[PDB]
Amino acid sequence: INNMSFLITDTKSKMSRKGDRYSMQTSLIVAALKRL
Amino acid sequence: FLQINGYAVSRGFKDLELDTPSIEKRFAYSFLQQLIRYVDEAHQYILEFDGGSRGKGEHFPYEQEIKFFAKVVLPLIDQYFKNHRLYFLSAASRPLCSGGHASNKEKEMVTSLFCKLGVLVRHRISLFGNDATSIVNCLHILGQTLDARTVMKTGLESVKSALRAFLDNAAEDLEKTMENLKQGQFTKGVTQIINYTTVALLPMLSSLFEHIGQHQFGEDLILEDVQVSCYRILTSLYALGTSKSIYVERQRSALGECLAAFAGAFPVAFLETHLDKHNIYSIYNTKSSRERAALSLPTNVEDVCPNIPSLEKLMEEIVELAESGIRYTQMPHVMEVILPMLCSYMSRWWEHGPENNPERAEMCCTALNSEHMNTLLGNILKIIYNNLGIDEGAWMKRLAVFSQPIINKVKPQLLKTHFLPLMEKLKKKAATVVSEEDHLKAEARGDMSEAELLILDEFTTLARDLYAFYPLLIRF
Amino acid sequence: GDVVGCMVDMNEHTMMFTLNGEILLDDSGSELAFKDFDVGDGFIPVCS
Numbered sequence: 001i002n003n004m005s006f007l008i009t010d011t012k013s014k015m016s017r018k019g020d021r022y023s024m025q026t027s028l029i030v031a032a033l034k035r036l
Numbered sequence: 037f038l039q040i041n042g043y044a045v046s047r048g049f050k051d052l053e054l055d056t057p058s059i060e061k062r063f064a065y066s067f068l069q070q071l072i073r074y075v076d077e078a079h080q081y082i083l084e085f086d087g088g089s090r091g092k093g094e095h096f097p098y099e100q101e102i103k104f105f106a107k108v109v110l111p112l113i114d115q116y117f118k119n120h121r122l123y124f125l126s127a128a129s130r131p132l133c134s135g136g137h138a139s140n141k142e143k144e145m146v147t148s149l150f151c152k153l154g155v156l157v158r159h160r161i162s163l164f165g166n167d168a169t170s171i172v173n174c175l176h177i178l179g180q181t182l183d184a185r186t187v188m189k190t191g192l193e194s195v196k197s198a199l200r201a202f203l204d205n206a207a208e209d210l211e212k213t214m215e216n217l218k219q220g221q222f223t224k225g226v227t228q229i230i231n232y233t234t235v236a237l238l239p240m241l242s243s244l245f246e247h248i249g250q251h252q253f254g255e256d257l258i259l260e261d262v263q264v265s266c267y268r269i270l271t272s273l274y275a276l277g278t279s280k281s282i283y284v285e286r287q288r289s290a291l292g293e294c295l296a297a298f299a300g301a302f303p304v305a306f307l308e309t310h311l312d313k314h315n316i317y318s319i320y321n322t323k324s325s326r327e328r329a330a331l332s333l334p335t336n337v338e339d340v341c342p343n344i345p346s347l348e349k350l351m352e353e354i355v356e357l358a359e360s361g362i363r364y365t366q367m368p369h370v371m372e373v374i375l376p377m378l379c380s381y382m383s384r385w386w387e388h389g390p391e392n393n394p395e396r397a398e399m400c401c402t403a404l405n406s407e408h409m410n411t412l413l414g415n416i417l418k419i420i421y422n423n424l425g426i427d428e429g430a431w432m433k434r435l436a437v438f439s440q441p442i443i444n445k446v447k448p449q450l451l452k453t454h455f456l457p458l459m460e461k462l463k464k465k466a467a468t469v470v471s472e473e474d475h476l477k478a479e480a481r482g483d484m485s486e487a488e489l490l491i492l493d494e495f496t497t498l499a500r501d502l503y504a505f506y507p508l509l510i511r512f
Numbered sequence: 513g514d515v516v517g518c519m520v521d522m523n524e525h526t527m528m529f530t531l532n533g534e535i536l537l538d539d540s541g542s543e544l545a546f547k548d549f550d551v552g553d554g555f556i557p558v559c560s
Contacts, residue, residue, distance in 0.1 A: 005437065006440075007541075010510070013444045013511060023540075025541040026541075028502060028503055028506035028510070031506075032509060035510050
């Protein structure tokens with residue numbers, strides 16, 4: 001799970017090492033709380 | 037002193053010749069020429085080794101050559117095309133406004149290199165050992181980098197024939213795999229083919245079809261004999277997905293994703309055969325009766341895919357799904373291959389649906405509608421609702437990935453009776469979990485001391501259900 | 513025809529930009545266009 005496949009996919013629909021490349025901001029729960 | 041006396045001193049060695057030709061004097065041209073030549077010598081040495089190892093000369097003098105090939109040429113190709121994908125994929129339409137605009141000959145040689153690597157990988161997943169991953173990765177990247185439209189509209193007939201023959205070989209391998217899986221499932225060529233398909237063919241075809249569908253290359257490349265080969269591929273993939281076999285049990289996921297990519301890429305509405313007469317791209321409209329009889333075709337538009345059901349019938353099957361309360365362990369292939377296929381098919385064919393173009397209606401290829409999508413998504417949601425607390429697996433997470441494009445054309449009235457019960461069962465599960473937490477606060481860890489495997493498993497299942505649903509929730 | 517809404521928070525020393533009501537983001541997921549800056553003599557709306 002990288003949350004990127006949901007982070008960078010939603011823009012088209014709305015028409016508007018591992019340690020360093022991995023972040024937690026793509027979490028579904030926190031994304032939902034921001035969007036709701 | 038020259039300047040103050042005004043003596044003009046110039047560069048003195050101005051360019052005497054234009055030195056213009058870009059089609060020949062480019063680094064990409066030279067590099068791909070060398071790469072294709074090296075792949076050619078690799079192919080000839082691999083056939084020589086095939087003839088020698090089975091003979092007296094098992095020892096191969098070409099150890100240094102094969103080592104250089106595997107350890108240099110393949111990763112170099114992979115990294116180079118990953119870095120410069122946009123340059124080769126650019127056309128008259130500009131993806132990268134800075135520059136680039138790869139030449140037609142360069143695109144031709146990209147396609148030729150992909151075809152040569154496909155020929156090399158065909159039925160040879162063992163001679164390279166661990167290099168099977170390298171060759172399949174290079175083929176994946178190359179297939180993502182192909183420019184099918186430009187290659188077909190301008191290119192050498194040899195390269196076009198190689199591109200057609202790659203798909204023909206893929207269809208033949210799929211047919212061989214199904215035919216030796218049927219009446220052969222009880223019981224080394226069959227094993228070699230069954231391993232080769234899983235290792236290489238399904239990922240390569242998946243990536244190529246996904247790229248073709250994304251870039252709308254199906255209407256330019258999948259024509260006539262290419263359409264016949266794609267019919268064969270579709271039949272083989274669907275029947276492999278539907279078949280009940282211990283061999284296909286653990287490969288049906290790759291079959292499902294490949295079938296979804298093929299449904300997205302294919303330019304003919306195979307599910308809705310009755311409206312195939314309006315599709316100009318149809319071989320059943322272009323090839324005419326005499327060549328369609330000369331070719332291996334059922335001569336009828338409906339009978340092209342006898343096993344694949346019609347869209348309405350498959351909608352009816354999906355509707356009685358999640359209403360009969362059928363579970364993943366029982367009837368798994370349907371929601372493993374059919375549902376991603378339906379999602380991809382609808383995502384492709386909504387633009388061609390009459391709702392996009394209400395004018396000149398009933399001349400459009402399909403009969404798809406936003407009502408079809410909302411019904412499909414509701415049936416999916418009922419499936420996941422019924423399989424929420426029991427029979428959990430990565431299918432919930434993968435189906436959620438597949439169902440994302442459908443959400444764009446869903447009315448908000450679904451949430452009035454679908455989107456609340458799912459969070460209802462989530463709060464019930466989470467409240468139960470925090471209830472046993474409020475009971476046994478003291479022990480909450482991963483090992484096995486006092487009944488904490490139950491709480492760990494319930495936490496994992498609720499987390500996986502939350503990633504089943506929350507992508508749908510946020511994009512709704 | 514796009515409308516850019518510019519927000520400044522001089523209490524927390526932050527700046528934000530929205531395009532048609534949607535908050536713009538940097539390379540990361542941060543909503544802050546400029547995370548930190550001294551108050552100085554203040555700020556005024558400006559365009560070029």
